[PDB]
Amino acid sequence: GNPLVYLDVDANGKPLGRVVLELKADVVPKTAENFRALCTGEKGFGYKGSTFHRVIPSFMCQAGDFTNHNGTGGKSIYGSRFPDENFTLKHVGPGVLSMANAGPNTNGSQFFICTIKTDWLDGKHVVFGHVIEGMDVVKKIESFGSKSGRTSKKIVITDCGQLS
Numbered sequence: 001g002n003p004l005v006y007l008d009v010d011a012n013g014k015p016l017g018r019v020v021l022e023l024k025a026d027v028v029p030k031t032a033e034n035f036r037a038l039c040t041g042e043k044g045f046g047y048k049g050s051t052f053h054r055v056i057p058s059f060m061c062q063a064g065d066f067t068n069h070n071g072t073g074g075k076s077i078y079g080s081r082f083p084d085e086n087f088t089l090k091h092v093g094p095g096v097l098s099m100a101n102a103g104p105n106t107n108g109s110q111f112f113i114c115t116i117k118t119d120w121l122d123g124k125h126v127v128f129g130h131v132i133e134g135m136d137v138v139k140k141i142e143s144f145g146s147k148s149g150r151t152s153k154k155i156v157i158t159d160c161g162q163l164s
C-alpha cells in the first residue's frame with residue numbers, strides 16, 4: 001500500500017505534535033519514494049533536523065531545504081533534481097502535499113503543505129500526498145508565518161520516518 005510517513009515538529013524548541021502524510025506512490029511512485037527515503041534518512045541525508053523556512057498564512061507551509069535551510073537548496077535521492085513525474089493529482093484543498101520547485105523539472109527535496117485550495121499551482125507543482133493526521137499541527141505552523149514567508153518562530157522537523 002501507499003507509504004505513511006511522519007514529521008514531528010517543534011516551534012522554538014517546544015513540540016507541536018506529529019503530521020502524518022500519505023504518499024500517493026500509486027500515482028507518483030518516483031516522487032513518493034524520494035520523500036519516503038528523505039523521511040527515513042536511509043540514504044544518509046534527509047529531513048531530520050531541517051526547518052519550515054517559508055510559511056505564508058492562508059497559503060502554505062514550505063520545508064525541506066536540508067542543505068541551505070533557506071529555500072535555495074535541498075537534493076533528491078536520485079541526484080540534485082528530478083523531473084516532474086505527472087500533474088494528475090490536484091491542489092484541491094488544505095492538507096495537500098506538493099513539491100516546491102524553481103520551474104519545470106526542478107524537484108529536489110523542498111515541499112509544501114497547503115492550507116487552502118491552491119488551484120493556480122495545478123500543472124506546475126507535482127502533488128504527491130496529503131495529511132492523514134495532524135492538520136492542527138499544520139495550522140499551528142501556519143500561524144507562525146507572515147505575508148513575506150518569514151517565520152516568527154523557529155520551526156524544526158525534529159524527527160521523521162516511515163510508519164508503514
Ligand SMILES: Cc1c(C(=O)NCc2ccc(N)cc2)cnc2cc(=O)[nH]n12
Pocket residue numbers: 053054062070071072073074100101102106107108109110148149150
Ligand atoms: C522562491 C522561493 C523558493 C524557491 O522557489 N526556491 C527554488 C527551489 C525550489 C525547490 C528546489 N528543489 C530547488 C530550488 C524557496 N523558499 C522561498 C522563500 C521565499 O520567500 N521565497 N522562496
